[PDB]
Design a protein around this ligand. Sequence first.
Ligand SMILES: [Fe+2]
Length: 188
Amino acid sequence: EVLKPRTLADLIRILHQLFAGDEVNVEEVQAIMEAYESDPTEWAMYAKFDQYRYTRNLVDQGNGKFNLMILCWGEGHGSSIHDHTNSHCFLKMLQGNLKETLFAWPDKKSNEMVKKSERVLRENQCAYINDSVGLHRVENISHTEPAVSLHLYSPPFDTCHAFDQRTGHKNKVTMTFHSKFGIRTPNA
Ligand SMILES: [Fe+2]
């Protein structure tokens, strides 16, 4: 019953329809993204890794409605604890596996941060998060294999906050692209 995109190209086309409006059905988007069968032949042009940290690779600008990007996690690479600047955020596995740890939001008080949930995203699985759901950290589970994920943010955003697990203090972080449309960006 779920519309199954047969290619990354089909999926992008479907996403343009699902975000053409002002409403967006989260479970519907989640199911269609999950239904797409990851095919490395179709997204290898975006799979540009860096030795020391993960990379963000823009695939499609979604007519200003959303950003679609591919994130490449080297061996052992992970993110900090961050928020998502009041946007919808979908992340689907394209290769390997990521461990998502959901964190609760900190008070004004300084305290160790509390884990709310911990899981591994399976092959082709699509997960969903926004700021009302919680904060999270994402990491490659493997020290011998990469992980690759497909992320969709609506509306688009280029700033977020990173959180110190020990205190809950946060810092604003401007997010950058490693590449856009298969083309490396100036200055990593
Ligand atoms: Fe995230």
